[PDB]
From a paper:
M proteins are the major surface-localized virulence factor of the widespread and potentially deadly bacterial pathogen Streptococcus pyogenes (Group A Streptococcus or Strep A). One of the primary functions of M proteins is to enable Strep A to evade human innate and adaptive immune responses. Despite this variation, the primary sequences of M proteins generally have a propensity to form dimeric, α-helical coiled coils, as verified by direct experimental evidence. LL-37 is a member of the cathelicidin antimicrobial peptide family and constitutes a major host immune defense against Strep A, as well as other pathogens.
Residue numbers in the entry:
A (entry chain A): 38 to 99
B (entry chain B): 36 to 105
The structure:
Amino acid sequence: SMKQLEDKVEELLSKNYHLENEVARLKKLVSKLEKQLEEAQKDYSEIEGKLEQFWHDYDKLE
Amino acid sequence: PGSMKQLEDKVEELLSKNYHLENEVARLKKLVSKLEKQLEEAQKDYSEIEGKLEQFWHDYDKLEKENKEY
C-alpha cells in the first residue's frame, strides 16, 4: 500500500508535468498572439492614416 | 504510517495543482481563442482599408487613362 502511494505520486507527477508543458505552450502562444495583435493594430492605424491623407490631398485641389 | 502521511501530503498537493493546471489550461485556451478573434477582426479591418486604397488608385489612374483618350 506504500508501493501503491508511490505509484500514485509518480502517476500524478507525470500528469502534472504534461499539464505544465501544455500551460507553458499556451502562455507562449498568448504572448505571440498579443504581439501579433499589437502589430495588426499599428498596421490598421497606418493604412487608415494613409487613405485619409491621400483623400485629404485629393480634396485640397479645389 | 508517518511516511504514509508524508506521501499522502504529496498526493493532495499534486492533486490540487493538477486541478488548477487543468483550470489554467481551459482559461488560457479561452484566452487564446479570444485573441484569435481579435486578431482576425483587426485583419478584416486592415483588408477593408486596403480594398479602399486599391479602389482609390483605380479611380485616380482612371482620370489619367481617360484623359489620354481625349
